[PDB]
Amino acid sequence: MTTMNVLGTPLECCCQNPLTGFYRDGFCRTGAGDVGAHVVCAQMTAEFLTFTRSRGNDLSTPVPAYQFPGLKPGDRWCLCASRWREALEAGVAPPVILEATHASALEYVSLEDLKAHALG
Amino acid sequence: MTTMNVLGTPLECCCQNPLTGFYRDGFCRTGAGDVGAHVVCAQMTAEFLTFTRSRGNDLSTPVPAYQFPGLKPGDRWCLCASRWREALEAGVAPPVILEATHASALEYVSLEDLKAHALG
C-alpha cells in the first residue's frame, strides 16, 4: 500500500532545508535527467568544498534560481561518484553515510573505500 | 523494485540533522509504537514551542539520550495532531507542509484548516 498525505498524494519527506537528492525528494537516487550520478550521500567538509571547486565543481556559491543557498560544511548532500572518487584518490574524501548512498556508487568505487570513509 | 544502497538494504534518506518522524526515517508516518499520532509536518515557531510546553508538551528542552538536541523555530517536525489542533483553536498553530503530513491527520482536523495554515 502506497502511503498517503492529506492531499491524496504519496506522503513526502518531512525534510529540513537544505533539501537533498537530484530530484529533491531527499534521496541520493539517480535516474534519467541526471548524468552526473549523484548517488553518494556525503557530509560536507570545507576541504572537499574547496577541493572540488578547484576541479570545476563548486558546490559552495549560493544561487537562488531554484532557491538554493549553497552548502555549509557538515551539511549532507548527493554528490557525483566521480566527483567523490576524485577526492578519494586526492586524499580528501568527505564522510559518507552508506545506507543513504545508491548501489550504483559501487560501479564507481568499492564497498571498502566507502566503508573506510563512513561516519563512525 | 525496492531501491537499494551499497550495503544491500533499501536506500534511506540523505537527511539533515535534526532527523524526523517518530521512526526516524524522515517521515510523519505513524504506526504501532506511537500512540501520539505524530502525523503533522509542521515548521517550528517559538510561540508554538512556548504554547505546547505549557500544555504538557515541551519539545524544546534538548535530551541527548537518543542524541536529540531539541527544536529551534523554523525546524520541521512530526507533531501529534491533537497537539497541533490544540494550537489551532488557541490561535497559535504552526505552519504545516501538507504533502508531508499523513492522511490520518484528517481524522483529527480538516483539509481546510490545514490548507488555511500551509506554508504559502
Question: For the structural domain made of A2-120, what CATH number should be given?
Answer: 3.30.56.110
User: In this structure, are residues B76 and A15 in contact, taking their beta carbons and an 8 Å threshold?
Assistant: yes
> Chain B within 8 Å of A67 (Cβ-Cβ)?
no
User: In this structure, are residues B73 and B79 in contact, taking their beta carbons and an 8 Å threshold?
Assistant: no
Residue A28 with chain B: CB contacts under 8 Å:
11, 14
**In A35-92, which ranges are continuous DSSP H helix?**
46-55, 82-89
- What does the block give as the cell for B8? 544491500
Structure determination method: X-ray
- Residue of B25, B28, B31 lying closest to B84 (CA atoms): B28
* Phi, psi values for residue B68, rounded to 5°: -125, 90
User: DSSP secondary-structure letter at B114?
Assistant: H
User: In this structure, are residues B34 and B27 in contact, taking their beta carbons and an 8 Å threshold?
Assistant: no
* C-alpha to C-alpha distance for A94 and A86, rounded to whole angstroms: 11
- Judged by CB atoms closer than 8 Å, whether chains meet at A18 and B16 is answered as yes
Residues in chain A: 120
Experimental resolution (Å): 2.5
- Residue of B54, B31, B57, B56 lying closest to B42 (CA atoms): B57
- Residue of B5, B23, B22 lying closest to B14 (CA atoms): B5
- How many beta-carbon contacts under 8 Å exist across A and B? 126
Q: Which residues contact A107 (CB under 8 A, 6 or more apart)?
A: A81
* Phi, psi values for residue B61, rounded to 5°: -70, 115
Residue A6 with chain B: CB contacts under 8 Å:
98, 101-103, 105-106, 111, 114
* C-alpha to C-alpha distance for B65 and B73, rounded to whole angstroms: 21
Q: Nearest 5 degrees, angle CA A80-CA A82-CA A83?
A: 65
* C-alpha to C-alpha distance for A13 and B15, rounded to whole angstroms: 9
Say which amino acid occupies B17.
Answer: N
Question: Quick one: residue A59, left, alpha or beta (phi over 0 = left, psi -120 to 50 = alpha)?
Answer: alpha
